[PDB]
Amino acid sequence: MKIGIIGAGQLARMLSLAGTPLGLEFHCLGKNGDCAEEVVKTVTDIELTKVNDVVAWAKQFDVITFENENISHELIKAINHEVSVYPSAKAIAISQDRLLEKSFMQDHGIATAKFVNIDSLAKLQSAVDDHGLPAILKTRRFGYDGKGQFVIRSQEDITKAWDVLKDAPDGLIYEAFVDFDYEVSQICTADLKGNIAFYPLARNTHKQGIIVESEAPFENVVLAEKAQQIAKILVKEFAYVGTLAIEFFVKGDELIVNEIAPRVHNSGHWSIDGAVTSQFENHVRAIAGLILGDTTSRKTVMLNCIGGMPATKDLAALDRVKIHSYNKEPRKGRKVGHLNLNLNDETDEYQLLQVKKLIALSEEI
Amino acid sequence: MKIGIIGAGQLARMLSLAGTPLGLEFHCLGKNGDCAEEVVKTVTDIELTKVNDVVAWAKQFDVITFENENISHELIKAINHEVSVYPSAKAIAISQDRLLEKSFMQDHGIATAKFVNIDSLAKLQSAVDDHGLPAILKTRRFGYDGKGQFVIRSQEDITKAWDVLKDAPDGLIYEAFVDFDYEVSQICTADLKGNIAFYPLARNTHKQGIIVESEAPFENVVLAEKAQQIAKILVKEFAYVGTLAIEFFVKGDELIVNEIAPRVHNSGHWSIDGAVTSQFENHVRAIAGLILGDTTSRKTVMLNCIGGMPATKDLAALDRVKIHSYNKEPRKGRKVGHLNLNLNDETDEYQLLQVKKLIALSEEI
Ligand SMILES: Nc1ncnc2c1ncn2[C@@H]1O[C@H](COP(=O)(O)OP(=O)(O)O)[C@@H](O)[C@H]1O
Numbered sequence A, B: 001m002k003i004g005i006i007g008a009g010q011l012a013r014m015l016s017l018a019g020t021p022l023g024l025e026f027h028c029l030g031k032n033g034d035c036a037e038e039v040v041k042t043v044t045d046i047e048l049t050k051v052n053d054v055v056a057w058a059k060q061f062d063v064i065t066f067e068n069e070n071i072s073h074e075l076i077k078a079i080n081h082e083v084s085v086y087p088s089a090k091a092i093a094i095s096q097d098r099l100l101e102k103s104f105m106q107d108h109g110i111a112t113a114k115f116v117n118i119d120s121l122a123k124l125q126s127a128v129d130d131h132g133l134p135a136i137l138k139t140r141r142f143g144y145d146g147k148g149q150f151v152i153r154s155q156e157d158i159t160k161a162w163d164v165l166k167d168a169p170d171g172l173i174y175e176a177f178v179d180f181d182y183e184v185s186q187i188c189t190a191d192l193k194g195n196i197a198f199y200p201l202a203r204n205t206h207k208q209g210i211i212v213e214s215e216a217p218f219e220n221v222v223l224a225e226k227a228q229q230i231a232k233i234l235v236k237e238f239a240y241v242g243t244l245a246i247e248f249f250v251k252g253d254e255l256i257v258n259e260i261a262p263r264v265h266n267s268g269h270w271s272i273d274g275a276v277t278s279q280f281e282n283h284v285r286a287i288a289g290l291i292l293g294d295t296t297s298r299k300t301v302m303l304n305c306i307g308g309m310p311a312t313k314d315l316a317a318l319d320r321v322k323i324h325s326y327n328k329e330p331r332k333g334r335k336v337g338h339l340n341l342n343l344n345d346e347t348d349e350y351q352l353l354q355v356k357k358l359i360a361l362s363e364e365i
């Protein structure tokens, strides 16, 4: 069976690394030199605006998936008409737009931050009057790792935020600042029949809008049950197939949905070395019509390499650390790799302190 | 760093799968369509007899290794003159010839089967007179999985074995039949400085000359210490760098060396899902000048897929089995994949019985 992936980034790279031992053949749509090229059969550079050429490319394979949900859902709708695409176009359209995303949660009694669609300066002032400060003005589409946003701390920032983002295509959205204690994420995989394989919750640490550390399992039976019930709602309403990610705010014993990602997620990279079946192999198993793998997990921490990465010779000296270099070009703010480590004894805690000092010397956010 | 591998088979395929997350770039010498092609950067088809063209190919990369020890050690000697090759040419020359292999063991007080070089029919009769029957006449070079041999059960088989193999290039060798209870293998990795990372012993099961099942760890402190001391001798005498494999016969509490393989070995495929660092990643770490990874292991069984492989849909139903299809063309006697499974509880034993019944329906030896 041949699997086509829209995008040739690190997520497609690790999808192929996990799925290739299953006997599957992988092909990517992307530019030559992208980090997935050396682990996939072919890479084809086609502008996504040429819908007919993308469909003709997709029809060479048995199933299509994607690594970036910001692509046109009409393109996915056109591809899915002739070759199956997972997950669905409905999951893309709702996930790629913050307004539609939070409107969906509200329509299903799922708690999120207070949000208002922003289409004028007066609409922004009314949202600040109703739901207070601090707050954040975000673009509805595109923008990642905090880019394309303006935090409103005072009344003077209202007109400044509007001036920057007023002409952003596809609109803006107001978000009230959430009083939360910490952040967790729920990652799961749904097969063709709707069966869901759940991973334990992962507590995630952000640094300037980017995720830098993820630790699993996060033990909380109350929060885990509510997160799974939220995931079951999304899987059913989306007719979802593949790996799904939901990021939460935690305030007390109550969960607040931040955003969802209809794909394998950064907060699940721990599962490569922490679970019997990683989020990547199970996403591959899901879209290929296979039964999902067992997801029994052990305590492990993931550390992101942003901007730069410690020397492989320095990382290899900590012989328990599992190295996952993406072979990407180093650039400030860019995710170039991550590091996993099972935490069992004090030797694990010792190597964990040394690898964090290495990251601090190479990290550029 | 760029790593060149002579050969593009399943061993090179899994070397690249294990080393690519380390940030390393892999290139193979082999035919297009070999199963390592889709996971390596490039594959180049060069006849190994064209020594100058192979050296020019190898000089594009930072270090060279190989997956088949039956290649010319003079070729490796020529390549190593201009770009480092691991393991050494001395390890190749001794391992690739059964006579030189057993003569080496005898020169270091290492027990093997009784062996005599065979260069005439009278020499074979004298070996049978001295060391009895049953016995096996083998080619010194080439021939694998039992091919190119003739078992001598009676006096009538002496002239029959000689007639078949007399004109075999590079000679023949007599071997006395070993009275052994079972078979184990010792796999280890030596870095550039001579440090050895040891894996636990693996008990291996053969079926008609081919290995079909490997289980680790095999608990025997007495046999394990002797196997490690034998490995240390080979690593030092060979100036060895990389993963090394030694297969033993076991009769009581004493080890009898069967053969050695200067490479990653079939009896170590369990380490992909059983060890913190598999034999493949550690072979890559060794030749790349990196510090080896921790080799803490858990109980796991490997089952070989020979001739055919069970349907991926059938294998995926046993969600704890780790699937390793080589994406090779099915043919009687050919290794097309293997399956690993951690053994912890009775659910593991249950899925183990079901996967063995699947293999019996697809296996063709
Ligand atoms: N409404 C909010 N209230 C408080 N913090 C927020 C809010 N929205 C985002 N954040 C912060 O930003 C991080 C996530 O950024 P996000 O909005 O997901 O960026 P993007 O969606 O562009 O990837 C979170 O870890 C959180 O700390």
Ligand SMILES: Nc1ncnc2c1ncn2[C@@H]1O[C@H](COP(=O)(O)OP(=O)(O)O)[C@@H](O)[C@H]1O
Pocket (backbone or CB within 6 Å): B113, B136, B142, B143, B144, B145, B146, B147, B175, B176, B177, B178, B183, B206, B209, B210, B259
């Ligand atoms: N001298 C011997 N005595 C008993 N059994 C042997 C002997 N040599 C090989 N065998 C059998 O053959 C198997 C290994 O085959 P081998 O000789 O290694 O083939 P090749 O070297 O061509 O791969 C072993 O599992 C063992 O059962």
